[PDB]
Design a protein around this ligand. Structure first.
Ligand SMILES: [Cl-]
Ligand SMILES: [Cl-]
Lengths: 448, 448, 447
């Protein structure tokens, strides 16, 4: 259900029919691994079977110790947030007196419990790995019985499997300085994360969304290492919560629109700068200028509101009439007529200027269209590639209807003699008022 | 072999003698892993070796299930592509009815075959891991014989080794949402990648280039997850093919050039904006502004043409005469007189202005040159470091001849009273015409 | 310990009380893994145990062979060559007999200081001895028992020794021989702590690097070097912090606009000099891209190559933006958009037009509704801030914030002569452009 319209008048295109999944806030959950303190490693004896357990135990002890030492266009308009301020703030609460004992006591009988913290916040807790009981009750007795010798290779391997996850958690936190993204399957296994989602205080619609897109949920999550206190390692996994789901979204593609004069430098250029993603959101429209921060799975767009501006619904009018009076559409102006192509959701916008060769090709037929100078467009139906100069573009092969909206290029309505060709953060009305002021300066001087 | 020239007139430098290897297109290959779906693990019982086999199978069974849930300046001129549109398109073709079986039957007897897909395109296929046959014909018969008990721990390891690759593949696809780059060695081993290149429909020069730089080929490749259906897991590996090789290429380094009067704010500044890589390509010049997107191995430059502009060959004239009439050299203007240094391929450019302390040092001598205000340059022969203010630069110690092209700094030729110092995307002639137009308006008023 | 001032006059805030740790130079160290080239594996593949060591041994040879086959305002900063230093050390190692010096000095110990031919002395470190493991412990066991191994523990011990060499190969194979950060497979934590401790640096420096090894990794490079004779060597390029314990402050800026009701009648102005500022050697190192600096508690790890060197008078933009001694940087626009900049101890809120902006408490919800204009809220009673459809969480680090009241500076500009497309301007640039455009209006009136 994806459609696209090419506006030849403004050298732009809109892909519509996408569904929203906007991160509006954060959930913080506490993931704990229970460890055992190893006091006296009195094993000597250079025996092949003995050496492996002793070296494996040193790996565990070193990893525990290693973790303890760790504690000791238009994008520029956007604001700046503190991505993990929410998760880290929960992490500071865990350093308070007795805060681990609440967690540790609540996770005594089950691996999943809701803990009320000292500040009042209720947080999911999750014991994902119990190394204490394995070492204290199953390994050390077996190890001790035969004087630091183990007569069964299967016991050393079972320990390597148990120990491996803690080793990789440490490995990730040591090169990521205690905050990772995405949340790897070592920090949170696939089944654990699904259990987190099913127990979160969120909608059934929300749970379904997160559960069918765990690969995206990881990518929008942080894992923040926290404490190794008492006999427990805890880290906070900061998961995105999607407060806006299933509202309509559209992607605006824009490209340079220039005159087609024969004189090299007599040309004028004009580009819509408002490129990016747009989603309906609470009666307004969330605008995401850097479209690379959004991830598209099939027809759903996952974006993050911290990278958005909040705009009136009338921003959509820039697609139907760039000179409409209700919203001042943003553009930049230049004298730089260079050829390029913008691959859209359902086709290719081609800005072909000068002597550059611009064509569109089929896999079975070769070149099927040669572009004339100006901004033109091609659908992904008969076309597989587009070539602009020495640049070959592949076109998206997603199915869907394109509509070519015929229109006179807006750049023709400007007189090159009064055109301001150095505006990067301008608009329809700003360029108008700059021409009018430059045209009145030229009219009043002739009346002199 | 490799040479460099510093143009004192324009505060820039060009490194010559580099060879091209431009990514111009894509090859997509289908890499398959054959799995066996095992319904239930009906051997529930305690035994050291049995317990390991059960956990190893449960890790394997979850891996299949986890995969199944997975499937359910001047840079701003470059334009936008769809980086994996080619591979993703091939991925969709594999979803058509019976298309997997065409692949599967062709790879029954060998691990490498060329398959003609339903849309007609021929794509190399590659069975890299046969777990179905291993589990169905080697492990499950051994396991079943002794009521799921194995008298050989070596059986567990061989399975845990075989299974390891499938587990890591799932790990990569699970945090990358099915698209990874560079292509890891779990997705494609070094030997498998060399075997693909040897069987690809490319030149012997092309096969040689890709084979001697497999680390680069990986870094420029994508691995696109496709289907896990029937007894086949398949993913598409999208490799870059280098259609332009061994053409002369050069890198342009630029730095700001300003006046050096003692009065703080009476100064004017000028910078060439066309820094980046330039390669001859099909009679034209491919310009890469973003020099970070290019990889240099020794003397070969690996760039990607979608991050390029296609420019006329006369761009190279900006280096011999910035005021040439045949190509309008791009520049920016400012009043921001800040000190900096730009390290070149063979030396160091120094923009030293105001009261900033700028020196060049030798390891055997200490400071050997102190820069005066203005733009200056040093060769890498006797110099190891360069210091501009509080920042120490190390110089590349690559071997090669340097040439200092003496010339009067271009900034002296402009009148400070009429100089337009707010142009970001301007040029020699644009600054000329804005001065001439601003100089004539003051001439026309004085006639009064 | 940490304080913050909000300047309502210029819609900005400064957080002070940070201490510096500026990377100023590089230490290059040579890390070696000793390998053994194995001629003929003319064993049998019948016994289950032999197959594993033989296949594990084939795994090793491929890794050895594979490695041989391998052989605002940011735009002002300038260009460096990040690993020119370590690569320079690597190039020296290709010279005749220079590898033997390394190998003979690490004959008896695993750590040695070597003097290179060009005269520079570099710490050396043998981190893995696979040659000796294979030559003296594995291959002798193997041949004796008729090319078969009767102890499963022997194969695992080899798979463990070999595993690191395999994982190193995976990393250089995917990184084209230059990695960052330096992984724990390239340099284990104990080795890195030993390297720092044996480095020719201050005790203040060693303590700093040793308590922050995770940051030392992130600022380090591993440059794959040579595989010649019986040794693989790679250079680990470590950051040395030549500026420590000087005051640092972060400047946060947000747009400051007029608040007329007429849609497009508004004027805007924002300070562009946002980023980190640290005193060092009588001047000020300015870091515009604030994402390249890492904060641990109250220490700011920055890299001087991503910095400008500024006169100490830059701080005057915080006491009076119109000072004549330093021309403060600004950008000007007519784009009256709402946003928020979260600072160390609070939230700057630029709320304009019809956008809904509130500050909320976890126990009370909305506790302040902002009026149009640029305002600021301390992180004390506030946990979150919402500007339009975006909820920001505020930093909860403890510290005092002070609200400096003032008339917004944008009100001192006349809307008729205001240059509204200046990105790299200044107080003095906009002043003289008003004079030039306001005087041009006088010539017609005197006419
Ligand atoms: Cl502990
Ligand atoms: Cl060619």
């Amino acid at each position: 259900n994806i459609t696209e319209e090419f506006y030849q008048s403004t050298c732009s295109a809109v892909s519509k029919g996408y569904l929203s999944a906007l991160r509006t806030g954060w959930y913080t959950s506490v993931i704990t691994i229970e460890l055992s303190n190893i006091k006296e490693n009195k094993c000597n004896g250079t025996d092949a079977k003995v050496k492996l357990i002793k070296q494996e135990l040193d790996k565990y002890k070193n990893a525990v110790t290693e973790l303890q030492l760790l504690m000791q266009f238009l994008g520029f308009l956007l604001g700046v947030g503190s991505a993990i301020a929410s998760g880290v703030a929960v992490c500071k609460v865990l350093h308070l007196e007795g805060e681990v004992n609440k967690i540790k006591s609540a996770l005594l009988s089950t691996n999943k419990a809701v803990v009320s913290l000292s500040n009042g916040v209720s947080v999911l807790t999750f014991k994902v790995l119990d190394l204490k009981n394995y070492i204290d009750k199953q390994l050390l007795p077996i190890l001790n019985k035969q004087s630091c010798s183990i007569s069964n290779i299967e016991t050393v391997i079972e320990f390597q499997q148990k120990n491996n996850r803690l080793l990789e958690i440490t490995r990730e936190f040591s090169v990521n300085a205690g905050v990772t993204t995405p949340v790897s399957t070592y920090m949170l296994t696939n089944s654990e994360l699904l259990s987190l989602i099913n127990d979160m205080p969120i909608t059934n619609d929300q749970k379904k969304l997160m559960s069918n897109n765990v690969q995206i949920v990881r990518q929008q999550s942080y894992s923040i290492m926290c404490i190794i206190k008492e006999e427990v390692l805890a880290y906070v996994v900061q998961l995105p919560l999607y407060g806006v789901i299933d509202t309509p979204c559209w992607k605006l593609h824009t490209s340079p629109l220039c005159t087609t004069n024969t004189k090299e430098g007599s040309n004028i250029c004009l580009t819509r700068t408002d490129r990016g993603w747009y989603c309906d959101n609470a009666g307004s429209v969330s605008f995401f200028p850097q479209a690379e921060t959004c991830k598209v799975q099939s027809n759903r767009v996952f974006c993050d509101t911290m990278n958005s501006l909040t705009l009136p619904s009338e921003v959509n009018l820039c697609n139907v009439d760039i000179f409409n009076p209700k919203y001042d559409c943003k553009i930049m102006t230049s004298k730089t007529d260079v050829s390029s192509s913008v691959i859209t959701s359902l086709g290719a916008i081609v800005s072909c200027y000068g002597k550059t060769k611009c064509t569109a090709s089929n896999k079975n037929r070769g070149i099927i269209k040669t572009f004339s100078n100006g901004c033109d467009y091609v659908s992904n139906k008969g076309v597989d590639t587009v070539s602009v100069g020495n640049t070959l573009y592949y076109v998206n092969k997603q199915e869907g209807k394109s509509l070519y909206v015929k229109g006179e290029p807006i750049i023709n309505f400007y007189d090159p003699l009064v055109f301001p060709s150095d505006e990067f953060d301008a608009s329809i009305s700003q360029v108008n008022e700059k021409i009018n002021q430059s045209l009145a300066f030229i009219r009043k001087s002739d009346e002199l």
